[model samples]
Target: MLQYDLRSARIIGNLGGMSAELEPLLSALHLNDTFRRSDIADVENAIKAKLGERGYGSATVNSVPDFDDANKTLAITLVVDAGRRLG
Candidate 1:
């Protein structure tokens, strides 16, 4: 499952490990030279799916992150910059 809706333009497939939805957005981002092309909310969706699949209750990701701080840290920062630059 995908953790976040990778909104970073620099996130190439070379980075690897991404959901189907993320690939197109990532490609669009790169092709357009924009980083604000991802549907960031997918992060919550994935979390909800994972939690439900694991029988961890219907825990929706109403917060930021509860996973690896490393990638998330980078993705968030990139997202911020992307939003600012794009909008």
Candidate 2:
């Protein structure tokens, strides 16, 4: 398996915009659950939707994968860039 369990989730980059709205999404995640390669897209979409609701329609959420063999889990870092606004 590419990844087995949700060991940890981290958020980085420009978060000055949507921490309040995004907290629910992050908190509701199923930790210690199995995640396959296909599950990555779902995670990304959830983040995008959360940002989109907070006026970040052009935001980009990128996932960087890291393996923790010691604990047999996957660590996902979500890099978010709340794109600029245009009139």
lDDT, model 2, position 41: 67
Task: Write the residue-wise lDDT of candidate 2 on 1-87 in tens digits.
Answer: 444788778777886477666656666556798855545667678878777776778888888878888877888788888786533
Cα lDDT of model 1 by residue, 1-87, tens digit: 343333343222211123343334333232212223234455445534443443444343332323334644223321211111112
Taking all chains together, each candidate's TM-score versus the true structure is 0.30, 0.75
Candidate 1: how large is its RMSD?
A: 14.4
Worst 10 residues of 1 by lDDT: 78-87
Clashing pairs in 2: none
Task: Provide the global lDDT of candidate 2 against the true structure.
Answer: 0.72
Reference-based lDDT, each prediction? 0.33, 0.72
Model 1 TM-score is: 0.30
**RMSD to native for every prediction?**
14.4, 2.3
